[PDB]
Curated annotation (Swiss-Prot), chain A:
Family per record: Belongs to the urease beta subunit family.
Gene: ureB
Coiled-coil ranges (or none): none
Pfam families, per database record: Urease_beta
Main EC class the enzyme belongs to: hydrolase
MF annotations from Gene Ontology: urease activity
Cell compartment(s), UniProt: Cytoplasm
Enzyme Commission no: 3.5.1.5
Protein name per UniProt: Urease subunit beta
Xref: CDD domains: Urease_beta
UniProtKB/Swiss-Prot annotation, chains E, F:
The protein, known as: Urease subunit alpha
Name of a matching Pfam family: Amidohydro_1
Subcellular compartments: Cytoplasm
Record-stated family: Belongs to the metallo-dependent hydrolases superfamily. Urease alpha subunit family.
Catalytic activity: urea + 2 H2O + H(+) = hydrogencarbonate + 2 NH4(+)
Cofactor binding mode and count: Binds 2 nickel ions per subunit.
Lineage of source species: Bacteria, Bacillati, Bacillota, Bacilli, Bacillales
Biological processes per GO annotation: urea catabolic process
Binding site for Ni(2+) 2: K220, H249, H275
GO cellular component, one term: cytoplasm
Amino acid sequence: NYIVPGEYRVAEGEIEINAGREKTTIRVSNTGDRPIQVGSHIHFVEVNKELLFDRAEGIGRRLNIPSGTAARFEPGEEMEVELTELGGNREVFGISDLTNGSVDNKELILQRAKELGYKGVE
Amino acid sequence: MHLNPAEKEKLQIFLASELALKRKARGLKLNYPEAVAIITSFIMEGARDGKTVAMLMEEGKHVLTRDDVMEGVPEMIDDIQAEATFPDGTKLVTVHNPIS
Amino acid sequence: MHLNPAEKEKLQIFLASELALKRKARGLKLNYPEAVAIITSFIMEGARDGKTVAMLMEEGKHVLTRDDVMEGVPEMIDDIQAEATFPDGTKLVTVHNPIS
Amino acid sequence: MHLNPAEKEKLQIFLASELALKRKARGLKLNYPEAVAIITSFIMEGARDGKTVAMLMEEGKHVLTRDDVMEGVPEMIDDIQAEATFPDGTKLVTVHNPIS
Amino acid sequence: MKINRQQYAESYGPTVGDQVRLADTDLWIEVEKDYTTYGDEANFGGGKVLREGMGENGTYTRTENVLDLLLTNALILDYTGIYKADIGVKDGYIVGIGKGGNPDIMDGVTPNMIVGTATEVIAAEGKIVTAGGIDTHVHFINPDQVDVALANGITTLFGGGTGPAEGSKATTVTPGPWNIEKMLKSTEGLPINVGILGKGHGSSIAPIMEQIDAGAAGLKIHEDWGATPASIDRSLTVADEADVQVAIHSDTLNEAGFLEDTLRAINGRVIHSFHVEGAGGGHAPDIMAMAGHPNVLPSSTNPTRPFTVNTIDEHLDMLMVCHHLKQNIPEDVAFADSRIRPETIAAEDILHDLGIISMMSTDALAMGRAGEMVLRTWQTADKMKKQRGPLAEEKNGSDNFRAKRYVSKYTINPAIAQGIAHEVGSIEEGKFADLVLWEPKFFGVKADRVIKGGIIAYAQIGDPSASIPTPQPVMGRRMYGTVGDLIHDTNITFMSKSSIQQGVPAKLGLKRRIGTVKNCRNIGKKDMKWNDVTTDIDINPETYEVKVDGEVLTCEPVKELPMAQRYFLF
Amino acid sequence: MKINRQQYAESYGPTVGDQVRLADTDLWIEVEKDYTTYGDEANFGGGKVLREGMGENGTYTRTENVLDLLLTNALILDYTGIYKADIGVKDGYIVGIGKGGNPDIMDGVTPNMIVGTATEVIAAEGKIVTAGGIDTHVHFINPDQVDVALANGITTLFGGGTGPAEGSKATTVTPGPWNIEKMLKSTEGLPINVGILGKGHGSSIAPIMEQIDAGAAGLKIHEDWGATPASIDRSLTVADEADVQVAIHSDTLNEAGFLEDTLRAINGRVIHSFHVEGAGGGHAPDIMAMAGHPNVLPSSTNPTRPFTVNTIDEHLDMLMVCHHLKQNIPEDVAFADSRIRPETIAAEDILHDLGIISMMSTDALAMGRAGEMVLRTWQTADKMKKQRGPLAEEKNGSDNFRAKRYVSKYTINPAIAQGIAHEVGSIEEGKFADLVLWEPKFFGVKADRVIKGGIIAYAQIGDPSASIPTPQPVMGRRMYGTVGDLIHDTNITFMSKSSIQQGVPAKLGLKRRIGTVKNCRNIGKKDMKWNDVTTDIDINPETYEVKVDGEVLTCEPVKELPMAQRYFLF
Ligand code: NI
Ligand code: NI
Ligand code: NI
Ligand code: NI
């Protein structure tokens, strides 16, 4: 009976994000001395050079977290994150200039990453 | 007086608070703009008194209670923000959920 | 507060009424704008109190009498009109010949 | 009410004076615009009361003293000027060095 | 990964099946569908999705499917649906309703809704977005009335007047070529869309028609200028030639005829019947019977909306002032009194709920309130739900059917009636970007932001000297869309086809966008969205009782309304 | 005949060696030189010197070395000096600084400063006169912000925005050709000089460059649009081609890089680093180290100026609102918190005093106060004098060195940074006559009269119905320079060379004076007047301690400031 003006009455259930896309869990370490926070929609291979992880596993992927949220790595912090697949055309341009085209060009992306000192190119 | 644009505008917050305080004094449960005016004027007068921003952030939660206002008003006011000249210049006070 | 244009304007009727009431309290016979302000603010506060339009149409005739105002003021005021938010929304109150 | 542009503006001097008088009443030393507002409103209310220009030129020097205001305020106010409707029409009152 | 519904709605606004209360009414709207792809919602801010290489595309130039403006996560309330979508604006028009972002990396992006270098963002998550209100009964009496209208979400003013002249204070009329030209030039400084009505009076065609050629967008027939069979006939002959609408305030006095005589003069031609209940004017006591006819587009004005315990008491003096009547003339008072009937006001509530009255309007400053058309529409819907129950057509416990019926009354239907729905009146692709954002707690009461031609024109915003825009005092203020020459590009002057063909805008130096009035003569009641009911309305001449399908239409007045003392300072 | 000093200063303003207190601060400025000839001072009024055949020449036509306007007996406070002179204005520009009057009879008249039939007079005796403030960090959010700025002596607004859209509420960006065109047209109605920044984001050149060709005067790189290595690089490539400045708000989150990565992307090119301390945005915690580099033009925004006991407590909620962050998202709060550091705010005070931060700015309505750039500059200088003492460079017990260092931060340095110092930013012959008169008791607090292009635009003035202009209420008001078409001639719209060459002003119908942005790419820290220090700034990543030349930079916050509760009603 009490009226809260403009209130919601949400339906039952839950919202599954990124449904139907492959998920991948990887370990990531902040080897730097300042905090690094990574948003939901950045091409994961193109994050800060001082994040150490298997860079190949970030290609064509982004964090599997709600749109507009982020993962925070304090200095020295290692943690596991879950990634999902990029969608749409699966192309990335700009950001760190590691891709500039299809995310299918793994060898070229990793070559650029290695030359520029992005940690974890194996 | 050399009033600037903000000084002119903020006079009308004081005025609205005076109006609202008269309505409260004759026994009326206050509405949304009335409640906002009272709390806002309280903050600006507190700054003028030389209180700190931190003091006003906590005092602002005890100016009006739910029995002072109409149904739903507490839930309509998520926060109140006001700027005023403290002894150390203009500062912003934000009072979160001022009426429980 | 989300003040709309009318809310801003009508604050200045309340203010003028407060000014006029102070002048009356120190013994002055009121002039034309003073008398209009007092009666107008009375109407809008009455609406806020939840009186009916019909109640205010008759009460508005007993707010000020001819001995409260300057010579000729009663005859200058043929009626006073004001709109305010009643419990059932905005309504117009017209008080005919408020001061006999 | 038929308010003209000056009547509208001068309401805000009365309002600022009311604000300043409340601050004085709770024990604050007044600042520059507060002091100017109080003295100005005093002049305009004096005209409304039917005092002469010469009376207000001398009374205006005794409204606030230096212990009522912040350091330096007396020296900041070289004079205060106000126009109001006297019984014999609009006149200018100038109060020189209102706070010694 | 899954998000619970409560948290999802807090972050992105509501999604399919969620309900939202309209202000402090009992009315609930339900999200019918959602254009998003869950996980790829657009949002803007620090570390958010609309960033270069991510949800913002860094490749495409503006012309290459990029938007000028994206409203993210809007809950649209429109005659076309109640649903969740992003809204894309370009060149001042709505170009896409769907899902915005970057096709590089996101699924389900509408192809012309790319967020690029050229794109501004307005966050609409948690807001209800509607079309701007279309007020077709405006008296141009006091320029301060424009902000009043904008503050309650009105974006188009159709009507007439030259300021506070007695003709304008009574009637929506800008008379003759010269007054029309002068008011078109005044309009250059009014931050709202405008169309001007000429005087629908004369016994010869040329004096009426020359107003249309001068730039009028329509005509008003008003009894105070003589609502005679001749004036009615000539005005409609003009309108049928010129393709503009005619509004009528009929002969209350029944001086030259009764309602049936007015209908005979109209002769089946299309007409917009103003304040059809009749307190605002018309054949006493039975004018509301016009709303049953297929060639009538019927509107109410707002002071009778809805029926309340104070409604009657305010009306006599309101009417006397508007129509320049004298209390010392018995027939003037009798004329006034003849127009104020609880029986027809009560029935008017119900006729709205049934879809028999199609439109709302203000009657601003001449027996009507410039800033309460939207307000009183929802108060009426709420009263009807309380007294008549949910409509039979409703599902899921929502009031979506009623909400679509009522939103149509002040958006799409007036636009259709006046021949301007190709430009304004609904949230549809290809229409002008006149959009109103509302916080649900303030819905229908005080607009948050009013967008005009793709730029914010009016907003509830705080201290201009503050560190951020939210500190007090928060009040309605004109924004940059109203400043300098931008006022020309964000607003439309609607004009007749003939005045446009004859070069009136160039002649007068008009810099505003020019809208063409068209397709006014080939419509009827059947074209009123959600409000298309034709029926025989019987009004008893002795008792004023209103019957439809053999049933008396009546309801009680209420002592209290929502959207009232919780919100307003006076 | 001799006049004592006290009486001379009362009559004509101060002369050589006299000192004047700035408002209620502890800062004293000393007259360094005086251009007058004692006994031939210009003054205007009944029985005064500027009369025909006397101090006014009655022979010469306007074109013959006569002024449109003479400001008599000004105490100029400028990067070029603190000195006493008459200022002569003609065709809206400062044409002479020296001694005005009539060469017929007066000694020492500057040859082009003749007072003739054509000359207006402003008495500046007893006033301090400065250049108009140049605010290069403006969010165009609420048009009411213009008067706020004028009232504190600001005459140029550089920045971006389209009104209270979320993109504009976070970032100084007017995105894309269409929004830029719309805001250039809005600018026609704003009584202040304006330049507009486009979105410095993209991975291709064309989407960024088309903003410059549309009429933008510069670009803003902001983290909320993705302050990535690519966006940084493309924006600077565009800027180097177009000769406009780029402002940066860097990646606070360190998402794509740390500070050293941003500097590598910049690659030695010129850039304006906004809010370089970082509470307003940038690489956490070490962004302030940018202010040591020779290619960086560093500015502060005003809420951290100066460090006070309440400064920290106000910031978290200010930031959350500006950047559209959610209190229920832990990483949003952590991002916000990462930006608020007493260690770097305290060091920022000292870096200003040392000439390592070159500029002040507001950040109006997006973590900054539109009317407090000038105010807080002097409060900072006063706090530094109190805590660090007179600078080593001072003489005569005056604070002239400090006053020149600090006045430069909001006048000449922002003008140099944005490529507009050929037109504005200082009191020099050949520059636009944007001048602010201050009573010393109100210096830096409330401007007396603001002159724009040689006509008064804003003034503190009284009752318009009174017998004279001084009776109450004295408040800030727009003057005739803002009215009608005069607003076009008294204000400048600054635009890129390419947009000017392509005829954008004619295309859009702009009537304002058009200023050309130029010489932005060939400057550095060495070109910042009185604030040209380059050095290695070390910021400890664990403690946030700031070191310069091996010394920790720290100071205490203060409980009280001058230029505060003595002056303001709220
Ligand atoms: Ni009518
Ligand atoms: Ni009407
Ligand atoms: Ni920033
Ligand atoms: Ni900013």
